[PDB]
Design a protein around this nucleic acid. Structure first.
Length: 817
RNA sequence: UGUACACGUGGUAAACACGUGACAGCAGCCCCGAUGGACGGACCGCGAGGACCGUCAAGCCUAGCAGGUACCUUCGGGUGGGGCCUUGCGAUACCUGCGGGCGAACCCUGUGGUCGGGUUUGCAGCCCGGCCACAGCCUGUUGCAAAAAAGUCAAAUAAAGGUAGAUCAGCUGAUCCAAU
């Protein structure tokens, strides 16, 4: 339709105008990085966390000089791959594509709209505003012509450092960004590829299920069986580094041609890869267009799908009667994301498998990193009943001798935090990630959230792929907690449960790998025999798997409490019990029943400044230095180390500073006035005729309720009061309510003042909250029931209480005579 | 191994016997991640802990990790310190490398040899990093010196006689709780 052509021309004109507008020191680059990371974090949190952990904070340090000269020859080099050979064709031998795009699959495609703009300039809306029918028409026209507009094919490449302190242009990685319309068009084609012919059962990477689930179990079962019955077992892991950087376009197209795919799709892929370009954007400087001759583009939707055909060919090239006989099951190869794990019993069989892999990789231009691959070989011998590890190098990939490793510490088949090949463990990659988070231009709450939700769930898998102990997990926990205490400036003697206890109970909710690794093992290997894999079911009924499952159950039972409502173990209850029973975490024990008293720790974090959040955390856990809290174990002196500095001649605890001290009386008045004004304004928003500090010269004495209000014939008294948490908050709420709801004459006075005759119309109420921002459940319910008060206006009263509490403490500290 | 216990056998029964065994149990709970070391002296409530003073040489700790060597095992395997107890079958000796923090060196370049790399069909060349060596009584010139002076009083020595803002510093660079 001409409407689609018109809107496409309009969008192209907008992109061209944006390009024309764009074209026409340490401090400044740090500020630019801060602005970029803040915009990215506020836009897409997961990608921002991935970028900050990956190390994309220091940017580059070499400019376009010595970076375009270093990388342009690398990106411009056509592979001299001979292409597929008839033997590989027969090894692989051991239709509905390119159909017109409908409107159902466009909306059905789960395309993440929370991305970054491409080089043309379509950021997030100009592609969202297009209706599905117009996008379908444009996609159909593109397939009919076989070409994408040349503005869309352009992509921008930016270099992210590998080493935190690069010393050359060679230690950067060229991550590419392409246009959103192209990505959306190619996502449909990738989904069609999956729906057409799925990969083999051995290939459990880019599949429609969790990939590294049963692979670790199968590897560990193989290792345990070989170690048990004294069999011969060779396990070679070879990683596909530059899987994305040396594949030849012509050989890839030829392989896709003989797989049986339609001629049109192969021609489209050939046109896409032959007509390719790239702009090297370093420090927001332009570069001349760069040709690319080595295929599989970084970040393209089709790339991890195109490489599945190559990996399927590689797997089909393997010899038949090779592998390990794990319980009458022949396990040949385990394909991770970008790794091949080959198992064999005979040295000749392992050499044969490696040789086949190498020959296929050589005939299609792939390079295999012998610096990131290893072989672990267990050779038994008779008359000794022991297992011996090979130390000298025996296998080789086309001449280069593969290194022989004795242990299994290459559990890096988890994804990012890529492999070191027996040089360093999985740690010192977590430490590097912690440093990346620590040095980035972020806020302390942002660091907490990134570590909570993106760092831990991404390395925790690797600690399962082997035999592990409790001490390693405890040491990892210690290191992570030290990093968190560095970020938040917390002292050493803070409750260990405070870091890990859930947000609802009051706590930073940093997961503890010591407790979530046994839970992961229990949840993952329990359903091992229910999986529809055949090798995994065989690995389920083994000896090492069962022993590890028993160890995991024991660790979970010792690091959990049984949930009454479901009769299941729960680490959250364990941490809650440990924290609420602590000294500093005791006063938070009431925060479980009021989930709105802890909405600032995670939910309403972006609304709080960094120093405000840090001081809120300091006051919440009572990390404030006082003569009582700061003198733990050093109370052998006189009363001068305990007496209040204001001359109160009493024990100077934080409660004394913050709740009863003549020095901080004005601060208490100010905090009370702030809370009263906030609630009064909130109630006036609800059409409540609010009076402030009413004058009731009652006969009994001098009563000063906080606020009084009325609405269409029903009145209310609200009293604001901030108290301690050592006693029950509900008893304080009731004791503050009774002195007004049972005085007898105050009710009549308020009824007369408000303008309502019946004294039962006006009901007394209170707004009770502790100085740690812990609500009283009765007070919260009464505020939500008597007066119409929504959740957003109730979640700020903890903020006001915490801010006023720290205000009082720093007023006490700032003047000392 | 050894305890406590279900079935079956034959037997009139038993404080009789044997065999097969729930993944059969029973192999208790809680707390602790610290810091250079050998040898002579003054400190402390000489008490559980913490300073200080001398030399010395490079190593010193480690309930972190990996692998190998022996012993007890029981087949599973097993080696830190302290407390509460209570019944509630367990397991130790060193050496090597890696990781951490304490040292110490380390700074005159370039040849060599290794280990990480990356470039590359290519371990050939190549450029980055970490180690090991090596072809070197006071008148003055030169090495320990925070900038023109403090004084090493016998040295080697002669017919000597600025930022968006703030801060620490030494206009620049880091550090923020500050930073779109």
């Amino acid at each position: 339709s001409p409407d689609a052509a018109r809107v496409l021309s309009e969008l192209l004109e907008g992109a061209g105008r944006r390009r024309a507008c764009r074209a026409m020191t340490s401090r400044q680059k740090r500020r630019a990085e801060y602005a970029r990371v803040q915009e990215l974090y506020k836009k897409c949190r997961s990608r921002a966390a991935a970028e900050v952990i990956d190390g994309a904070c220091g940017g580059v340090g070499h400019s376009l000089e010595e970076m375009e000269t270093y990388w342009r020859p690398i990106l411009e080099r056509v592979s001299d791959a001979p292409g597929p050979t008839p033997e590989a064709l027969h090894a692989l031998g051991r239709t509905q594509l390119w159909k017109p795009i409908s409107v159902e699959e466009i909306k059905a495609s789960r395309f993440d709209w929370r991305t970054s703009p491409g080089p043309d300039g379509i950021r997030s809306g100009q592609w969202r505003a297009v209706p599905v029918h117009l996008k379908a028409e444009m996609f159909n026209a593109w397939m009919a012509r076989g070409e994408i507009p040349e503005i869309l094919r352009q992509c921008r490449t930016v270099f992210v450092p590998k080493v935190e302190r690069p010393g050359g242009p060679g230690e950067y990685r060229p991550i590419s960004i392409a246009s959103i319309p192209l990505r959306h068009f190619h996502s449909i084609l990738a989904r069609r590829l999956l729906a057409c012919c799925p990969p083999d059962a051995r290939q459990r990477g880019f599949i429609c299920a969790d990939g590294t689930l049963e692979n670790s179990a199968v590897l560990d079962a193989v290792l345990g069986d070989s170690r048990k019955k004294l069999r011969e077992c060779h396990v070679a892991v070879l990683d596909f580094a530059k899987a994305f950087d040396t594949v030849s376009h012509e050989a890839l197209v030829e392989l896709l041609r003989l797989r049986g795919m339609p001629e049109q799709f192969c021609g489209y892929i050939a046109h896409l890869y032959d007509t390719a370009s790239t702009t090297l954007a370093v420090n927001n400087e332009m570069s001349s267009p760069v040709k690319v001759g080595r295929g599989v583009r970084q970040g393209d939707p089709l790339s991890p799908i195109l490489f599945n055909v190559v990996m399927d060919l590689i797997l089909a090239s393997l010899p038949e009667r090779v592998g390990y006989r794990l319980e009458m099951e022949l396990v040949s190869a385990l394909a991770y994301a970008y790794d091949l794990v080959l198992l064999a019993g005979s040295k000749v069989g392992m050499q044969e498998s490696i040789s086949a892999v190498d020959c296929v990789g050589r005939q299609m231009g792939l390079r295999l990193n012998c610096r990131k691959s290893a072989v672990l070989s267990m050779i038994p011998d008779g008359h000794r009943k022991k297992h011996h590890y090979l130390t000298e190098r025996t296998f080789n990939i086309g001449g280069k001798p593969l290194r022989q490793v004795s242990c299994v510490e290459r559990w890096r088949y988890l994804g990012v935090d890529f492999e070191a090949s027996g040089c360093v463990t999985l740690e010192h990659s977590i430490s590097s990630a912690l440093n990346n988070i620590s040095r980035a231009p972020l806020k302390p709450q942002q660091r907490l959230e990134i570590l909570r939700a993106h760092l831990i769930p991404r390395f925790q898998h690797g600690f399962v792929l082997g035999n592990i102990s409790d001490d390693r997990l405890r040491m990892l926990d210690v290191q992570i907690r030290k990093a968190v205490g560095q970020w938040l400036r917390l002292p050493a003697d803070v409750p260990k449960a405070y870091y890990h206890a859930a947000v609802q109970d009051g706590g930073l909710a940093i997961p503890s790998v010591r407790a979530t690794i046994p839970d992961l093992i229990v949840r993952r290997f329990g359903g091992l025999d229910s999986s529809p894999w055949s090798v995994a079911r065989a690995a389920a009924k083994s000896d090492k798997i069962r022993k590890k499952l028993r160890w995991a159950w024991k660790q979970l039972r010792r690091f959990s409490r049984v949930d009454s409502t479901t009769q299941r173990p729960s680490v959250r209850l364990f941490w809650r019990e440990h924290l609420h029973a602590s000294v500093d975490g005791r006063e938070l024990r009431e925060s479980t029943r009021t989930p709105t008293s802890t909405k600032w720790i995670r939910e309403r974090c972006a609304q709080i400044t960094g120093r405000d959040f840090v001081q809120f955390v300091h006051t919440h856990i009572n990390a404030l230095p006082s003569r009582i809290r700061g003198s733990r174990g050093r109370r052998g002196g006189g009363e001068s180390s305990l007496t209040c500095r204001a001359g109160c001649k009493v024990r100077e605890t934080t409660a004394h500073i913050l709740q009863q001290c003549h020095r901080t009386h004005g601060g208490r008045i100010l905090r009370h006035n702030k809370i009263v004004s906030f609630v009064a304004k909130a109630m006036e928003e609800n059409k409540w005729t609010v009076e402030l500090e009413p004058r009731l010269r009652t006969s009994v004495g001098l009563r000063k309720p906080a606020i009084i209000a009325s609405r269409d014939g029903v009145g209310v008294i609200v009293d604001v009061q901030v108290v301690s948490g050592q006693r029950s908050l509900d008893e304080l709420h009731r004791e503050k309510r009774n002195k007004y709801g049972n005085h007898g004459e105050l009710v009549e006075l308020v009824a007369g003042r408000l303008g309502l005759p019946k004294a039962e119309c006006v009901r007394a109420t209170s707004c009770t909250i502790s100085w740690r921002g812990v609500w009283s459940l009765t007070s919260y319910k009464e505020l939500r029931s008597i007066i119409g008060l929504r959740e957003p206006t109730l979640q700020i009263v903890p903020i006001l209480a915490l801010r006023g509490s720290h205000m009082n403490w720093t007023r006490f500290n700032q003047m000392t005579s």
